[PDB]
Structure 1
């Protein structure tokens, strides 16, 4: 059953079309085959989108797969909601709940709100690009108003190429006026690779700055530039290279010839191509389940003008979309589920931070569950809160009256408490205030030399330091050491 479909592809989406050609024969042919008529045409001109859509409807196909631009989303929704033709896409998700659209890209916005709330920012800059749309820009301003944030949002996308070396210099020097430190980028990969190079030229990647990339292929762009900088760069991934089928596709993908499939003989892959691959899995699961339920899709006639007045559609496409919304397989993004509208739920997004060795994950974020860090505590050097022993003596070390409600190093008060804070301020270490157990100053035992008290805590390696009323004698210098004396007294 070679079933007629239609495909829309931009002039330059060569990696994506090659991944579609791979996924075409990656799994098929125990059954029905596909008849893809490919349209390597533009996406900006909605008249061209109209011509291609009426051409493929003149063909009379059952389903159309491809991309759309923000100047075409209204046209695609307006034709598909009329003519009941199910349309599937990997592009940016739509704003309104529209029928007959399945969209392969998950949400980013709740993830990005989770990331900002995890880092606990208050004031930042937001460089956005207009031509991807403004839904995230609308979403962050509401929570910025509620969560008392201070956003300086800046449009950057309409800047031409021929002034594109000094516009960024004026832009970041205006950011130097408020002395910005925290930048969220929201662009395509080309604008990211343009803006990272201009940052690394004007010298803004030292320790102190902090960058969040709002894309899905965090490692799909260049990261060898600002890897060794000093700035810290975080982003998101939906394609995790650790997994079994992922690494299988990596080995399958690397061994292909570049000449037959352009952009294929690399290690990594674009997330757009990954979703294009999973789209074939969904689309074949559809016609699989319709032969499971044995429902015939016989058109039984020709199609005609797309301008038919009034045009009348066929509701077996409604049943096609109904069976599309029930597809649940595993793919490169993980599990998939759909809503009542065609939007994706049941996804998982990995949080990816850049380190010196390279990228690494620190946690995941689900469709309902918030940010769960994976407890990756590779911090090998923790400055230990050192052991400070003392004893209760007025006014050297005294209890407070409200010690149960307070905690720890706040509970004690006196001369020695004030002194130890000065020592730790001058020396930069961490400390915890402890008490000697046996309640003594300490002397040695007869015939066994067992120093008890505050002496043996330092002799026997128990306590680390002792700021306390201790008297320099002759018999104490042999086992512990003393500084210069700080307060004189007598019997």
Structure 2
């Protein structure tokens, strides 16, 4: 039972409600505690310090603090601003740093004691491109909220010079409600393939808008790059007949995955949710899953480094930790099944570029899988049409024929009757005689529908688009 501590940093409510990351981390340490298969001879305690958001100096002092008591490594705060402080601290004093939230990769930061289980933006964006290429859209549109979304999609942004496309870029304004006029111009814009890089909370705050302005019809298709696509308040909108599409490294196929999910769901609404916000209560989020996995990879390494020691170091004793060399390398080299699937580190950019992705889409019922993605081959997304269901080879008139028709004086008329009759019996005329005769000759089954616009049809120059009979044909 080798005692060990893990530094905990949480930008949080600074109040009574306790955050999800602290929750999953403690859930994680408990998971270690119960199953000794990992660490039969070892159990790790932890110190969990709590700070303010976007507030460096306070984080840095807390960083020195969790140095004072000594750990193996810190868990990064989930926001880049003080995250840089954390990182320039870690590699400065040699203790390996593990990050979960994506930060702005600084091009020349020569730090070396950091990895990030987060799906690196580049791979994600490449999959985005492959996806949209498959769907053969052209006038796509991005909408972000703050700056860094553009970066997340830079690989998207650079696409047009190689791929024949267009895309304007539109911005959700400062506050959430402000997006209604944006939807106004987009309605004016008539942009029928709009990808979104946005926090799922804002996704909710804008779906009410989109249904409210009735934009959600079957033509429109949105794809949401975020990874908590699971907990959307999906149920009412799936009957608007829209397509969504998105990703989920969050595996659910393992039954162990499930079981842990319900254990969480017991401890989760334990925390007071916000059902008024329109989020499905009772589902653990992607970030918390990541930071669950991270302790586990730390463990799956450390069990092979019993030479682990905890130097009670100070920020001013600038000599780094004694054993940061091989241990960090181990994490780089380790592999594991977390709660997202295969876990590995690139060991080149000192981050992660490898994982497994299931693309998921809004079916008639909700979120249902529509394929798999991995770095090597890329997209293996498949299609729910397979096995030739209810299909007969060389079948004759297997499906009936939908015959359109016009109403004209001697050509097609109503069989003059008093009682209400319907179907293909209201219509009677010379063209009907011809249709019946040729259908008997060719042996088919037909249903009859009038053209709604009710004219022969001609090319409207202003749109170059057919009308009436020709268009419906």
TM-score, normalising length from structure 2? 0.73
CA deviations 1:210-239 (Å, max 9, x no partner) are 100111121122212321112211111111
* Secondary structure of residue in 1 paired with 2:9: strand
User: Where in structure 2 are the equivalents of 1:54-453 lying within 5 Å?
Assistant: 54-92=64-102, 94-95=104-105, 96=107, 98-107=111-120, 108-130=124-146, 132-156=148-172, 159-160=174-175, 164-165=176-177, 167-256=178-267, 258-259=269-270, 267-291=282-306, 295-297=307-309, 299=311, 302-304=312-314, 306-307=315-316, 311-340=318-347, 341-377=349-385
CA deviations 1:40-78 (Å, max 9, x no partner) are 222311222222212222333331113231323432332
Q: Output the CA distance in 1 between the equivalents of 2:232 and 2:293.
A: 22
Match of 1:19 among 10, 21, 24: 24
Find the structure with the greater CA-based Rg.
Answer: 1
Equivalent position of 2:426 in the other structure: none
Q: Kindly indicate whether the alpha-carbon contact (under 8 Å) linking 2:220 and 2:243 is maintained by their aligned counterparts in 1.
A: yes
Q: Return the offset for 1:24.
A: 0.8
Q: Output the CA distance in 1 between the equivalents of 2:269 and 2:396.
A: 63
TM-aligned CA distance change 1:277 to 1:68, over 3 Å: closer
CA deviations 1:347-377 (Å, max 9, x no partner) are 1111111011222111100022121123421
Q: Output the CA distance in 1 between the equivalents of 2:150 and 2:32.
A: 37
* Secondary structure of residue in 2 paired with 1:373: coil
For structure 2, list consecutive stretches of 5 or more residues without a partner in the other structure: 274-279, 406-436, 445-473
Q: Output the CA distance in 2 between the equivalents of 1:73 and 1:272.
A: 15
* Secondary structure of residue in 1 paired with 2:5: strand
Q: Return the offset for 1:34.
A: 2.1
Q: Kindly indicate whether the alpha-carbon contact (under 8 Å) linking 1:336 and 1:345 is maintained by their aligned counterparts in 2.
A: no
Structure 2 residue 19 is matched with structure 1 residue 7: no
* Secondary structure of residue in 2 paired with 1:135: helix
Q: Kindly indicate whether the alpha-carbon contact (under 8 Å) linking 1:20 and 1:277 is maintained by their aligned counterparts in 2.
A: yes
* Secondary structure of residue in 2 paired with 1:71: helix
Q: Output the CA distance in 2 between the equivalents of 1:228 and 1:290.
A: 54
Q: Kindly indicate whether the alpha-carbon contact (under 8 Å) linking 1:227 and 1:358 is maintained by their aligned counterparts in 2.
A: yes
Q: Output the CA distance in 2 between the equivalents of 1:254 and 1:54.
A: 35
TM-score, normalising length from structure 1? 0.71
Q: Output the CA distance in 2 between the equivalents of 1:176 and 1:257.
A: 39
Q: Kindly indicate whether the alpha-carbon contact (under 8 Å) linking 1:351 and 1:363 is maintained by their aligned counterparts in 2.
A: yes
* Secondary structure of residue in 1 paired with 2:261: helix
Q: Kindly indicate whether the alpha-carbon contact (under 8 Å) linking 1:90 and 1:104 is maintained by their aligned counterparts in 2.
A: yes
* Secondary structure of residue in 2 paired with 1:130: coil
Q: Output the CA distance in 2 between the equivalents of 1:385 and 1:64.
A: 67
Q: Kindly indicate whether the alpha-carbon contact (under 8 Å) linking 1:132 and 1:187 is maintained by their aligned counterparts in 2.
A: no
Q: Output the CA distance in 2 between the equivalents of 1:290 and 1:20.
A: 22
* Secondary structure of residue in 2 paired with 1:33: coil
Q: Output the CA distance in 2 between the equivalents of 1:146 and 1:38.
A: 48
Q: Kindly indicate whether the alpha-carbon contact (under 8 Å) linking 2:11 and 2:78 is maintained by their aligned counterparts in 1.
A: no
CA deviations 1:306-333 (Å, max 9, x no partner) are 255xx22135112221111121111211
Q: Kindly indicate whether the alpha-carbon contact (under 8 Å) linking 1:60 and 1:303 is maintained by their aligned counterparts in 2.
A: yes
Q: Output the CA distance in 2 between the equivalents of 1:266 and 1:317.
A: 41
Q: Kindly indicate whether the alpha-carbon contact (under 8 Å) linking 1:218 and 1:237 is maintained by their aligned counterparts in 2.
A: yes
CA deviations 1:368-389 (Å, max 9, x no partner) are 212112342168688999869x
Q: Return the offset for 1:91.
A: 0.8
Q: Return the offset for 1:126.
A: 0.5
Q: Output the CA distance in 1 between the equivalents of 2:232 and 2:341.
A: 22
Cα root mean square deviation, aligned: 3.3
Equivalent position of 1:53 in the other structure: 63
TM-aligned CA distance change 1:201 to 1:270, over 3 Å: same
* Secondary structure of residue in 2 paired with 1:61: coil
Q: Output the CA distance in 1 between the equivalents of 2:95 and 2:180.
A: 48
Q: Output the CA distance in 1 between the equivalents of 2:268 and 2:193.
A: 42
Q: Return the offset for 1:288.
A: 0.3
TM-aligned CA distance change 1:46 to 1:40, over 3 Å: same
Q: Kindly indicate whether the alpha-carbon contact (under 8 Å) linking 1:253 and 1:266 is maintained by their aligned counterparts in 2.
A: no
Q: Output the CA distance in 2 between the equivalents of 1:211 and 1:10.
A: 31
Q: How many residues align?
A: 386
* Secondary structure of residue in 1 paired with 2:102: coil
TM-aligned CA distance change 1:371 to 1:58, over 3 Å: same
